[PDB]
UniProtKB/Swiss-Prot annotation, chain A:
Component of the large ribosomal subunit (LSU). Mature yeast ribosomes consist of a small (40S) and a large (60S) subunit. The 40S small subunit contains 1 molecule of ribosomal RNA (18S rRNA) and at least 33 different proteins. The large 60S subunit contains 3 rRNA molecules (25S, 5.8S and 5S rRNA) and at least 46 different proteins. One of its GO terms (biological process) is cytoplasmic translation. This is Large ribosomal subunit protein eL27A. Signal peptide: none annotated. Keywords: Cytoplasm, Nucleus, Ribonucleoprotein, Ribosomal protein. There are 2 genes for eL27 in S.pombe. It comes from Schizosaccharomyces pombe (strain 972 / ATCC 24843) (Fission yeast). InterPro entries: KOW (IPR005824), Ribosomal_eL27 (IPR001141), Ribosomal_eL27_CS (IPR018262), Ribosomal_eL27_KOW (IPR041991), Ribosomal_eL27_sf (IPR038655), Translation_prot_SH3-like_sf (IPR008991). Its main location: cytoplasm. GO terms for molecular function: structural constituent of ribosome.
UniProtKB/Swiss-Prot annotation, chain B:
It is found in: Cytoplasm. Its main location: cytoplasm. The lineage of its organism: Eukaryota, Fungi, Dikarya, Ascomycota, Taphrinomycotina. Belongs to the eukaryotic ribosomal protein eL30 family. There are 2 genes for eL30 in S.pombe. The keyword Iron does not apply. One of its GO terms (molecular function) is structural constituent of ribosome. The chain holds residues 22 to 115 of 117 of the full protein. Component of the large ribosomal subunit (LSU). Mature yeast ribosomes consist of a small (40S) and a large (60S) subunit. The 40S small subunit contains 1 molecule of ribosomal RNA (18S rRNA) and at least 33 different proteins. The large 60S subunit contains 3 rRNA molecules (25S, 5.8S and 5S rRNA) and at least 46 different proteins. This is Large ribosomal subunit protein eL30B. Keywords: Cytoplasm, Ribonucleoprotein, Ribosomal protein. GO terms for cellular component: cytosol; cytosolic large ribosomal subunit; preribosome. It comes from the Eukaryota.
Swiss-Prot record, chain C:
Pfam families: Ribosomal_L34e. It comes from Schizosaccharomyces pombe (strain 972 / ATCC 24843) (Fission yeast). One of its GO terms (molecular function) is structural constituent of ribosome. Component of the large ribosomal subunit (LSU). Mature yeast ribosomes consist of a small (40S) and a large (60S) subunit. The 40S small subunit contains 1 molecule of ribosomal RNA (18S rRNA) and at least 33 different proteins. The large 60S subunit contains 3 rRNA molecules (25S, 5.8S and 5S rRNA) and at least 46 different proteins. Component of the ribosome, a large ribonucleoprotein complex responsible for the synthesis of proteins in the cell. The small ribosomal subunit (SSU) binds messenger RNAs (mRNAs) and translates the encoded message by selecting cognate aminoacyl-transfer RNA (tRNA) molecules. The large subunit (LSU) contains the ribosomal catalytic site termed the peptidyl transferase center (PTC), which catalyzes the formation of peptide bonds, thereby polymerizing the amino acids delivered by tRNAs into a polypeptide chain. One of its GO terms (biological process) is cytoplasmic translation. One of its GO terms (cellular component) is cytosol. This is Large ribosomal subunit protein eL34A. Belongs to the eukaryotic ribosomal protein eL34 family. It is found in: Cytoplasm. Transmembrane segments: none annotated. Keywords: Cytoplasm, Ribonucleoprotein, Ribosomal protein. The lineage of its organism: Eukaryota, Fungi, Dikarya, Ascomycota, Taphrinomycotina.
Swiss-Prot record, chain D:
It comes from Schizosaccharomyces pombe (strain 972 / ATCC 24843). One of its GO terms (biological process) is protein-RNA complex assembly. This is Large ribosomal subunit protein eL38A. Component of the large ribosomal subunit (LSU). Mature yeast ribosomes consist of a small (40S) and a large (60S) subunit. The 40S small subunit contains 1 molecule of ribosomal RNA (18S rRNA) and at least 33 different proteins. The large 60S subunit contains 3 rRNA molecules (25S, 5.8S and 5S rRNA) and at least 46 different proteins. Its main location: cytoplasm. The lineage of its organism: Eukaryota, Fungi, Dikarya, Ascomycota, Taphrinomycotina. The keyword Lipoprotein does not apply. It is found in: Cytoplasm. There are 2 genes for eL38 in S.pombe. GO terms for molecular function: structural constituent of ribosome. Keywords: Cytoplasm, Ribonucleoprotein, Ribosomal protein. One of its GO terms (cellular component) is preribosome. Component of the ribosome, a large ribonucleoprotein complex responsible for the synthesis of proteins in the cell. The small ribosomal subunit (SSU) binds messenger RNAs (mRNAs) and translates the encoded message by selecting cognate aminoacyl-transfer RNA (tRNA) molecules. The large subunit (LSU) contains the ribosomal catalytic site termed the peptidyl transferase center (PTC), which catalyzes the formation of peptide bonds, thereby polymerizing the amino acids delivered by tRNAs into a polypeptide chain. It comes from the Eukaryota. Pfam families: Ribosomal_L38e.
Amino acid sequence: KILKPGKVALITRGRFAGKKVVILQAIDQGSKSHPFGHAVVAGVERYPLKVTKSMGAKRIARRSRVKPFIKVVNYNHLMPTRYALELDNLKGLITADTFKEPTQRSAARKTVKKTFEEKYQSGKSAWFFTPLRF
Amino acid sequence: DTINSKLALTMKSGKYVLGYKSTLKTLRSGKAKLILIAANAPPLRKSELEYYAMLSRCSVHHYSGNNIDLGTACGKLFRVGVLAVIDAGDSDIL
Amino acid sequence: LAYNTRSNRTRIIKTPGNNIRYLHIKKLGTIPRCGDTGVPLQGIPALRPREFARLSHNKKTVQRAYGGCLSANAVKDRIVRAFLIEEQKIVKQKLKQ
Amino acid sequence: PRQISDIKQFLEIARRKDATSARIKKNTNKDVKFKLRCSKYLYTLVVADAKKAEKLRQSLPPDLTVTEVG
RNA sequence: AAUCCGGUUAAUAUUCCGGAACCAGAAGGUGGAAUCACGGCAACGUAAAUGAAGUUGGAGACGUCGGCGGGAGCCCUGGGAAGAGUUCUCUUUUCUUUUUAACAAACCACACCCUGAAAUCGGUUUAUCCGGAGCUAGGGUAUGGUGUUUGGAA
């Protein structure tokens, strides 16, 4: 019961190892596609770089740009953390058809990236957006 | 001795899982009321179990004996470094 | 090359001229080993050190963090240990503060 | 020596300037072997029906110095 | 780092001749690819998929002995074929030979992952080894020692 929507966790398996993700939706009840403790998690593949006021606005935007990654991973693969991040734009956008339709997946990634950039601009969830050394 | 007797009674009355993955699954599900970890457990495994127990609000019991001693107390012939008890059953170990 | 040594490992083959000739077979390559565990990594073909250059970039490294230098089990353990140690430092700092 | 099973690419690699000489082999199995010499590799093609074999004789460019059985 | 086969001299051959490959380095050009690529829960996969300083990791690179498994060649042998025998008769018999290289293509099996939670102990070696630090079982992943089909090549 330690897994809830909007909770911050870390992925410990796969290509996106050691990347902080937020639980968009819990599928711990099990599913035919993933007969295990799977859940939809959205994380960051390229953490934003440090921003200097002397640098140009275009350069600052490029440094702050982050590439998100949305995938379903098992509960054992994930690692829950105390912190939790909740966003209005991240609620209700997760569905089976979203992962089923490739065009919907790209749209979801674009929406997640737009939401993350707004959060970075707002100066919130700095620990979550910051890359973790391992 | 009283804790060992309560654990032995719970092993036949309540629900218990004696294993790393089973306890981790039980801790994740939150059903594991108490988690018994042997003193000979690895520091990384003990810390991971403690973090999971803290997140799931479960009791953390540290057995003085090693995994062999924990298995002998549980009555099984297999070493069990970590065990998870969800229900105490007739016993009042919880 | 008199006084045959470990280098002169010859295998007899039948030529199309109905003749038996010895061909020198070089030592087989060794798959890269994981730095921490020491067990050989999975997904890397075992070729010679010089022949490893000809392979593509994706053919020598696994698509994961520390892939091709640390095993996946070691990678998972290293990631988990770092997170727990970071939490302990955070917990200790809060208590000390 | 790459065994080649696509007639069309055998045609285009013949027209490409790398091709130098071509040989045609008629074995006992009534199969026609087209061997094309390139800079580094000898490309061969095995066909089983004579009419396609003959059609690809006249489809080869005249500049190529084709030769019959050795 | 990288070569084989056949042929060739009065005397030299992995060197020469004929044919067929391989390695290293060098630039542009052409086509393809990304705007610092995706997929799979995972082990990982793919035609590509920038990485300075600085910091590491691996190969090279590592004792010896015994048994088991695999493959190759050699030896043994059944036919088939060829020739040379022996043979009043017997002897479907006696002797000899019966080739495919480097290299290049497609496919072909112990370590790990996923489901799983086990002792009524199971699996299993020629030799009892492992298992809640997760067995047997099911599905995968990688490593291909090799083998199959060719090309080379008649």
